[PDB]
Amino acid sequence: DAASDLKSRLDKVSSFHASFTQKVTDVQEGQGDLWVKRPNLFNWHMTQPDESILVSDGKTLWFYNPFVEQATATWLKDATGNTPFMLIARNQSSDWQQYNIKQNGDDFVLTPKASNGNLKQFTINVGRDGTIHQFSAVEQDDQRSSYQLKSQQNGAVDAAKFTFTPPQGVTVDDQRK
Ligand SMILES: [Mg+2]
Ligand SMILES: [Mg+2]
Ligand SMILES: [Zn+2]
Ligand SMILES: [Zn+2]
Ligand SMILES: [Zn+2]
């Protein structure tokens, strides 16, 4: 069905680096960069609305906001598809099943089946070759964001991209029970 088709497309390329022009509104332009190593490794970096870094080492998900010298460590398994990049990063059947999906070729539009969700809408254009051309989302607070592919390079990614280490003066809040 649409959910399985979408997941297959997002699993087509085992390892890749995709760069995106980012647009956010509460139009603020930024940059979004995603590094992936299926199925559980990823690194996401964006500049809007605030510079944020998300790194999964396979079991721990690190959330870092550089301009605040703070980072939070959580269990990757406890993460949710609360943002468009997290949905793509996780690419979990359990996530897609929670949305009413509508597909037409490479285009997908998703809306949550139930309330109590930070995401009111998510859209994505991804071909069967695994190239993510664009994606967007509308969050509960009416915040909207869109991403347009600048370039996607398929291939092995350095392991260091999937490990986290703040510079200095950074406080780590460990939420892994
Ligand atoms: Mg890059
Ligand atoms: Mg394109
Ligand atoms: Zn690159
Ligand atoms: Zn940065
Ligand atoms: Zn394409």
UniProtKB/Swiss-Prot annotation:
Its main location: periplasm. Changing residue 42 to E: Loss of ability to bind lipoproteins. Coiled coil: none annotated. GO terms for cellular component: outer membrane-bounded periplasmic space. Pfam families: LolA (PF03548). Changing residue 38 to L: Loss of ability to transfer lipoproteins to LolB. Keywords: Chaperone, Periplasm, Protein transport, Signal, Transport. GO terms for biological process: lipoprotein localization to outer membrane; lipoprotein transport. It comes from the Bacteria. It is found in: Periplasm. Belongs to the LolA family. Participates in the translocation of lipoproteins from the inner membrane to the outer membrane. Only forms a complex with a lipoprotein if the residue after the N-terminal Cys is not an aspartate (The Asp acts as a targeting signal to indicate that the lipoprotein should stay in the inner membrane); the inner membrane retention signal functions at the release step. May act as a regulator of the RCS-phosphorelay signal transduction pathway. Monomer. This is Outer-membrane lipoprotein carrier protein. It comes from Escherichia coli (strain K12).
